Paper text:
Escherichia coli phage vB_EcoM_CBA120 (CBA 120), a member of the Ackermannviridae family and the architype of the new Cba120virus genus, has four tailspikes encoded by ORFs 210 through 213, denoted herein as TSP1-43. TSPs serve as primary receptor binding proteins that allow for the initial reversible contact between the phage and the bacterial cell. After binding to the bacterial lipopolysaccharide (LPS), TSPs exhibit glycosidase or esterase activity directed toward the receptor/substrate that allow the tail fibers or other receptor binding proteins, which lack enzymatic activity, to irreversibly bind secondary receptors to facilitate host invasion. TSPs form highly stable homotrimers, with each subunit divided broadly into two main domains.
Residue numbers in the entry:
A (entry chain B): 13 to 628
B (entry chain C): 12 to 630
C (entry chain A): 12 to 627
Amino acid sequence: SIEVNKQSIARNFGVKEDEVIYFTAGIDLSGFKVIYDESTQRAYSLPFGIVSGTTAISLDERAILTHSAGSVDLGELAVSREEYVTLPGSFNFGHTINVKNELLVHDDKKYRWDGSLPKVVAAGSTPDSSGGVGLGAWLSVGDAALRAELNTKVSDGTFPATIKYKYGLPSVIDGAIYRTVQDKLDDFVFLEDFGGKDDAGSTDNSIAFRKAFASGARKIRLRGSGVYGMATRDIELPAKYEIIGNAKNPEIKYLGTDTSFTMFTLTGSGPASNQWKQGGMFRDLIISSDVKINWMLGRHVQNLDYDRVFFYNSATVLNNYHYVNFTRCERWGSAFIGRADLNTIQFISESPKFHLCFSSGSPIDVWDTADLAITKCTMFAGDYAVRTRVTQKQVTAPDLFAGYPVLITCSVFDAVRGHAWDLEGSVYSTITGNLVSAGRDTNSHGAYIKGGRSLSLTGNVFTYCGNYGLVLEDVQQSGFVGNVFNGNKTGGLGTLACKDLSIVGGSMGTTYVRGGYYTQPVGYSDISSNSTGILLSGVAFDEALTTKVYLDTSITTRNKVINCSGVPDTIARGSTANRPANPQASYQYYDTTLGIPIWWNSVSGTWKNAAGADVH
Amino acid sequence: TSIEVNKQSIARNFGVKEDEVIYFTAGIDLSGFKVIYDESTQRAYSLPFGIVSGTTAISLDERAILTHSAGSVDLGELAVSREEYVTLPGSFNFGHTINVKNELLVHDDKKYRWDGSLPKVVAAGSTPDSSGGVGLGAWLSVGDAALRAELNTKVSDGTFPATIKYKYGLPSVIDGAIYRTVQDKLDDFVFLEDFGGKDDAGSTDNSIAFRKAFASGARKIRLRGSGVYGMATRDIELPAKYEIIGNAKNPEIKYLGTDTSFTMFTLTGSGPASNQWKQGGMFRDLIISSDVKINWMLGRHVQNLDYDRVFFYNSATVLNNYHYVNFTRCERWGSAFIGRADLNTIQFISESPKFHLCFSSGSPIDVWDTADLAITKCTMFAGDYAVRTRVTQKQVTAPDLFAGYPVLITCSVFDAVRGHAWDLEGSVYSTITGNLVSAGRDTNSHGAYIKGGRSLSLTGNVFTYCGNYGLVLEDVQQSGFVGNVFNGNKTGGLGTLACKDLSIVGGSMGTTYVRGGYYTQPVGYSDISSNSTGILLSGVAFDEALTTKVYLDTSITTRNKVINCSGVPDTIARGSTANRPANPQASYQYYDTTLGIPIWWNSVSGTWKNAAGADVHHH
Amino acid sequence: TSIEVNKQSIARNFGVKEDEVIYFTAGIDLSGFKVIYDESTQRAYSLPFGIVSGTTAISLDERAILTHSAGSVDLGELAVSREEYVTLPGSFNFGHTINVKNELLVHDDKKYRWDGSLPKVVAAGSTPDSSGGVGLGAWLSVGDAALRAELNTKVSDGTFPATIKYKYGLPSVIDGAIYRTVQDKLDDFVFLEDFGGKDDAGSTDNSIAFRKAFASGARKIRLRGSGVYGMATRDIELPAKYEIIGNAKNPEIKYLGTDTSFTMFTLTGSGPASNQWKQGGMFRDLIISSDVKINWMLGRHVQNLDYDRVFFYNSATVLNNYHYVNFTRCERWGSAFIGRADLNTIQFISESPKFHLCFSSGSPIDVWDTADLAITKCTMFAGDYAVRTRVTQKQVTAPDLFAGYPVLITCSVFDAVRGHAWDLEGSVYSTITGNLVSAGRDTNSHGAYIKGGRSLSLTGNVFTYCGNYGLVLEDVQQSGFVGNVFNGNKTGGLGTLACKDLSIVGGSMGTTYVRGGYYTQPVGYSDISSNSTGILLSGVAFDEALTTKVYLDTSITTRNKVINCSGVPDTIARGSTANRPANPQASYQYYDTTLGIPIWWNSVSGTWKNAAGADV
Ligand SMILES: [Cl-]
Ligand SMILES: [Cl-]
Ligand SMILES: [Cl-]
Ligand SMILES: [Cl-]
Ligand SMILES: [Cl-]
Ligand SMILES: [Cl-]
Ligand SMILES: [Mg+2]
Ligand code: NA
Ligand code: NA
Ligand code: NA
């Protein structure tokens, strides 16, 4: 019966029986709310835009209702009103869609087709394999689909890029732009983002660094407070890295037993300045190893920084390096090794600098390096503190000597087993205001300069050293003013084969201050009596010193003492044959052949005695 | 039976039994049934649970309120609770009346119900917002299309982060941790990118991004990129206490134009007094660059500025009336520091620009009217000069004799500078200690030149391979020069012009022929124009091969005197009988060139005697 | 028939054709039909697609399990997959029995289906959580109301960030990047605000926020705000290796009360030994302040503390038994540093407080029993004094003669201090180089005062316009003073009291009348009480206008001796026969005032000779 069918259709759409009609080519649609196609057995809501007299024309399988007025897609209107038919079966069985309001199930979720009809779906299809999802293709419909899509997006990583973010909302801030939460979160990189974990050896964080750097990331932070094990050697750093610890809590640590293991490399492409790789910063972290390693190897590099780094058994090795700063670092069993033989052009490295560092058992060993500078540092114990060497050495006339400057200022060197300073090839150096107490364990000088030229060593204190406080060997044309040499085992200041040095002011002796000293037996000694041009002026010697000065001050040596306490001013004296050849006017000479003083008279051009008589 | 057929199709619709559907009729017992039908309205509604036997139907209105024996029930309300709805034929656009709570009206392919009082009339061309809004007591959206559109809107319009509650550490419960929003937590940091910044090499004007970020109240601003942030709008005023942080020295803030008068940033106090100086801030870990030479920052009436790990390229820093500025771990290429004080109309002095651990190439430091410039542990290479000081007000009035200010230069290296490494005018109370200077070769200039100096100390420096003298002092007085080395300079080691009361002690002069460069220095110390007085040389170790070790007039009236300088005569007391000193110290020894003998002043006899103790003739 | 009619009604509901609906009857061929009807339960169900011809029906139970000749199918499960549901009468609160997977039961205007064993009896008064829970195998929410409510709860209850998966760089696929959660990524950083901190000027007690933040294990804590964070609970103990980071020096951590005994933070080791010292941390980029004077931090038994770009106001730092502490780029206003060591019951010493690039006004540095205080590149203005050192344990036993410690003061400026710039007691091995001092004018005090000094060097400093002497040395021995300038001081340049064996070399004294302030200095160098010995002046350039250049007893027994100081006579060896030196070097020259002649020593004969060679 048509009446009962119209009636149950009315119940479905929530309308009145009076308001339903069968499509019939020639009816006045006006007034009806729902139309029924008896051929397809589908019902459709009618557009509110229906005027009396508009009569049917043709109603097709696509539910396109052609009437007198114009035409209407009843399927499209049905989607608009969320009035759907869920087809039997599924994408897997396949089916054909003819109307915009037909749904097809895939995996317990429904889809409608937004493209051209009819749409045939072959058996074994999925929405993706049959047009994909989007405007003009498959669009998901309904509860199950929305739930799955939300669960999937939240759980698969895609959600943060779909959330728009703007700084300061809900406040409207002039100039703030829309970004995504993904973008904003990506403003920072932690090692953890690349699988890093401070789990004390379970994770190989070497690979996390490698991957992080390969992504283009440069500034990498450590979240943890524990030990990040490193197990793959020779990770190459990118130019201008910055690795940031969590407030000096976490360690980047090698936990193995291979002393050849190296954590990181930094490598330029060749020896010239345009080939040096730009370094970066390590800060606020511990670099450590249970065995001694060279933790980083830099070759052909410039502008490296380490700030607030704690190094444990981890030596830094650089070869052909240019400007490196260690600031506020703590170095335990962790040497600095600088070389330049890879610089095949000039055979030089430049400016390793240490500021506000503390070191224990951590020597600084630089060869063929210009302008090593150490300022406001404390170095404790170790075999030695500072060593310099020159491996070129062999000069060609008119050059007479090869070497480089160090600058060492207001630093403390204490309880070093050997020399605090073992400086070979020191040229134009300035060494000012330091405290040195070293060498006791090996009966070594506190400081030893072998091969020095044109340098200044000013205002330093050498105390309680294992031999001399300071020994100068093969040093020329250099100044030593205001230095104190106290309580040293064998002597204060010693020279060997030096030439043209000034030793001015300061003081030598023993002051017996609580905390350690020897009774120093010698002040200044030219130990092998073979220096010339050594000038001592104004030095305050402790009267109790057994030997204040040992120095040959005979007339041809050019060695001379003036106003040094407990030592006479050098007197020109000698035999008649050793009278000077070109004396200044009124020159006074004590003639040991005659046993009298004599004076050079420049007008007569003769030596005379005190009574005015010519001698000779 | 048509009633029965209708009852049946309704039972199918609700999933109930056929006999559980009842028509409304006044008086009928409602117990047991599940669904009631209104024959007038032609609507069905689920009945509420628990209608006990005896309850009889009384009335049912167009709003689907059912009245019965034991009370009443809003069947529209019940239907909403069970998500049992009717979608009316219209839309908000054609207009409709809403009579019951479970009727839905379509707006833009989405459904809404009315949560207000009923009936609800809706004129054509209405919307949920125009007809009472959306929320409790008004329109509430219902169903799939609505929820999908609202979620899409929410997620895409920026409001979502503020709705997500966040607490640090969850799901762990951390004592003291508070609830915030994701929005809040994300806003804890500001990147230039948040205000439109982009390192796209000139497409974006990042000057505006800085201006907008600062105006928001942001102070600490980070750069995310590794490329070039182009700057195209001049004179962006910095707030007090900014911090601009680059991405590990990778990105550049760069001027790409051709106007050499462009300036990126200004920092400007409100006047010249200390409580009016604007508090500066920090630039760190980045490159400040320009293709043409510019003054990239101009500070006027400012205090407490820091630059740390900044690489400057063609970018000069210009400050006028400034107080305490630090450059630390900077790399300065073609990038001058220019300090002035004429805007300080109170004292006309600026204070304490300080450089530490810097490397400079072609980047002079040029300060006028500035007290306590300090350079420590720095390297300066090339350039026209490295350090220049000047005093504008060379205007003193007696009893004042001189005007100037101190510099402190310590353990720094100045190398291959084309002119003077140090060009110091008006240098007073300065300390210059432990430095290396090799400068002036390209222009035949002194390594260092002090013109107008008072009461200063220059100690333990090395001047080597300089283009004229290592160091020249002109109009310097009451100053000490101890332990300095002067090696292999073109013309001489140390020179004086019109100086007074200087001590030159120790150190050494000569040439040591070290591989890397030197001249054969022909002169040690020279009083170049023979017009200085009170110049005291003591204990200086001269290379014997020096042609002229000392050039100095040591006659009695000059007060110039030499003692223990190798290869140089000591200044001896000597002269004619007429020139015997008038008030000699006790036992004074004088070589009398008239007599050709030494004589001694005896303070007891009050006479000059020879060595035999006889008085010499003396009127 | 009514069966025909019911089938038609059902067909409309499912959107199928009338002949595609079938009643379950045992034995029927099921193929071809789309919907089946159970006439007993009066429920309809979609049939699964593709039942093959000849598949005959066996049974259909109250669970809607359809058993047939080829197998069985759960039509309830299929209904769920197609979102074809029945909403039961009633609710969880009234109770019900669930028999089929596609039955829904309402609770709180939301629907649930049962995913567990059927049937499921729900007792009256139930809720989903009370009647089995929500999740797989239990209750599962269905539909619009439920989903809306669940979305609102999940965003608002704090659990959402941990549910959102995150990976760095998406949608780009970055090798090595791992999945984390948004919660994890946000938790990478800690602000004080996360623990309730607020810069609301006293309303919030931020002391407690810090306590809670550190108790969580967090170490690096950031301040978001630019205002005042009030602190109201005293003695918050810092963890080891904290880092507190201000917002670019804008915010203040401030005490707003009136109790001068209030202390913000403590850092406390477990005892005096090196393995018991607590590792400190960093404060940076912030203001520490109080309206009344307080000791804002108290450190006891501590090592490795840093303060960088901190502005201190009325806030003294007090450390007792401390080892290595750095203040860099700090501004100190009315904010003393107080260093002590009496809590070190082992050695009674503290070590290496260091100041670099600091500015201070009215903020003295007062350290007792402390080795190696170092001040470099600093400026100190005003205050009662700038730098003070003291020794508590002054008494010594033979062979010790003296107790004290080094200070290192380099290239720093001390100006307009009311009393002494430097008040140094027990100064041993100190190096004081390249400083500028102008102090004491307000109290007629010396610019610098060293009382008890040994084996130290003071080089290349300038002392100008001080309130008495530029520098006074009292009880100083075996020390060097080279290249210093003493200008324009009220009473004198350099003074000594009870000293022994000092060298004073070069530099200059006088007044240069430079605009900006000076006195007319009346005295150069003075041995003020005429009781020092072994004082050696060499090469000092004195202003000719000085009224008294040198005040010093240079008689033969005092070992005091002047050479080449302008305007001062050179010291001549002279005196009575009784005071002739015993056994001096050969040809030593002495003016014998008893005989009124010079005489020369002949070492071999052990006799004095006159200039004619005769014994005297
Ligand atoms: Cl990062
Ligand atoms: Cl690699
Ligand atoms: Cl003569
Ligand atoms: Cl602006
Ligand atoms: Cl006499
Ligand atoms: Cl606590
Ligand atoms: Mg129906
Ligand atoms: Na290796
Ligand atoms: Na307290
Ligand atoms: Na007295």
